[PDB]
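Q: Could you write out the predicted structure for this multi-component system? I'm mainly interested in how the pieces pack against one another.
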Amino acid sequence: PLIPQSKLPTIFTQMSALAQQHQAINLSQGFPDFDGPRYLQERLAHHVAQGANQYAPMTGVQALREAIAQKTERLYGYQPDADSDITVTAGATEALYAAITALVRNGDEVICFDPSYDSYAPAIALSGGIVKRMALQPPHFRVDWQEFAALLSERTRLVILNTPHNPSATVWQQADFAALWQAIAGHEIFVISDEVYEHINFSQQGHASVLAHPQLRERAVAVSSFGKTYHMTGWKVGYCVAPAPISAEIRKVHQYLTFSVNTPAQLALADMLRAEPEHYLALPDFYRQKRDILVNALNESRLEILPCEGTYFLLVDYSAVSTLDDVEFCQWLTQEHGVAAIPLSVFCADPFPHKLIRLCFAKKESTLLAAAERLRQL
Amino acid sequence: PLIPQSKLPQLGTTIFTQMSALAQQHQAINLSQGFPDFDGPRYLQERLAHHVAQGANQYAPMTGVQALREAIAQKTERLYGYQPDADSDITVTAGATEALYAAITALVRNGDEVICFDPSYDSYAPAIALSGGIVKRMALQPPHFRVDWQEFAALLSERTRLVILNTPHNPSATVWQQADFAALWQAIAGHEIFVISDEVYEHINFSQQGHASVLAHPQLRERAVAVSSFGKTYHMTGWKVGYCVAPAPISAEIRKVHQYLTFSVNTPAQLALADMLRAEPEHYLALPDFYRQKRDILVNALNESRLEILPCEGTYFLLVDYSAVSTLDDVEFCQWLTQEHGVAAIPLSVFCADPFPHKLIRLCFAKKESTLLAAAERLRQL
């Protein structure tokens, strides 16, 4: 038995096991416990039946890329080229890995922000990139542009940002993108904007996308996730929008990663985009309702809430209630009050000196109400 | 305007989409496409809809749905005589393509040398390059494309880290026998050389002994990765669901990569496939006879044409030598054939990194009887 030497030297699985062993309300898992639109499900079955089950084009089904182009135009006032700027991928996860892999060379420095979604770091490492982390500080987790400016070097190749922000639930304002552009304008720095929660922004101001900034747009990759937008994360279909030159390099990697993406699913997704276009304009109110169920319960609790601007996650400060560290507090919470959450420390590379936990409210009303009742015991 | 330097200034192919475009322009029988022109099993499609309807549409486990991994485990045991561990040895991926990229990315470090065999499936090389690995090619020779073990031994070095073999072999339609795997073990037994066996066409082996898998060899097994594709087996290439079998330690590393590649794969599809595996195991057991019938339609047709055929031992591809018909190189010949005789084929030279001094073209017989009969009637005129 020959053993490989890892080129990359379980939390989410503990919580669901502890939540199961103690019948705790699951608010840790970052996906819905309700299903998606059946129109989409119905169109999938229709395309499978019509026999559209063989390889799809490498860049994605034509109808889908064109439908995505139109959506982009309606939303951000600019129309990408459907044949060269849009690429369908097996989930946003693959788009991120493809974009990162296409842009990061050995020794390149990539600026990221913590707390962070855990998939960026590994991809950057597999391409031999160096991660430079900015530690966003609670409660507002705003980007300290002066700290940012200091992280730049001649090796800075890419900036990966996530907005709305998982796990902090904060969002980037138009002004933040303006500041990013002012900071990287004179440098050869690419931008990857993880905007999978693009339709879950509670500001009246609306979602501020990198695609709305004319200059950043020409040097950036926007990543979206259908699984996240249509409440069906297991469908694994996403895409990225980027200038032709950049999308071309994303495609070179993608083509050998998976080559093509589930064909029926794509056609179904195309139908959904064309049949119910204003569908996402409703998601903000849809999730704001769910968010408040948890917020109102926590206002009668010794637990404190941080402002939730986006994503379907919420941050809670348990200082007044306990002295334990977040990881073990969550274990205590699950075991003593039947509510499972995720400690914010698992999203940080370096020590996080705070008493914050992440709660997901992308759940059925009954789940949120049951959670609310238990949160009110603290 | 920012333009990225490509990590792959490696000019890439459009040979397949171009042949199809030429075929439709001249309404030619398209035998160049490496996928069915008929649909998959109805039961599989039904079960997909069933799981979608039952709400099984959220993230599946990172290593794949538990039920699919066990069904694969018991299938492996029945076929090759050994039962892998369902939890640690099997990993579901979004197509064999991702299983290959993941396995290759997890084992190839910068500078590592990987031995490959031409003619070759075009996805191995680029994945190796992205990990900074060095490709060392063996040029299998017609008519039998048998491995030259002396040539192989010569390619080995202290930097050889991996051997990628594809059996049944696309595009040569040849296969590895039990003795070939025996030879492989003898050749690499003393070095830190891992093996990746692309066995997507494992259920399309026309041998009397049947498909010889790397998984059937006790020693090669604990240092190898077998790659499978459900899309190939169930005639629905667009479903993109594959997997790889490897020892816990190797799977552990494949998984570390896969997890950040796609993380999880279409959940309802995985459950649908598991049902298909448990419910109708006979579907793959009858695939050889199913394809031998389609193959023979082409074999008998050209048995009077002046074109010659080489032995097709596996895959749903067939090699045709056109020496007695034209002096054109294979690329110009396939164009001429599509335009003048209405039958689209793929030149074998596009599958080779180095010059291929032969007049061979690849035909795909994974087509409806009506498609194969029409092609047969046209190939007759040569």
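A: Regarding packing and overall arrangement: Chain A has two domains: 1-36+277-378, 37-276.
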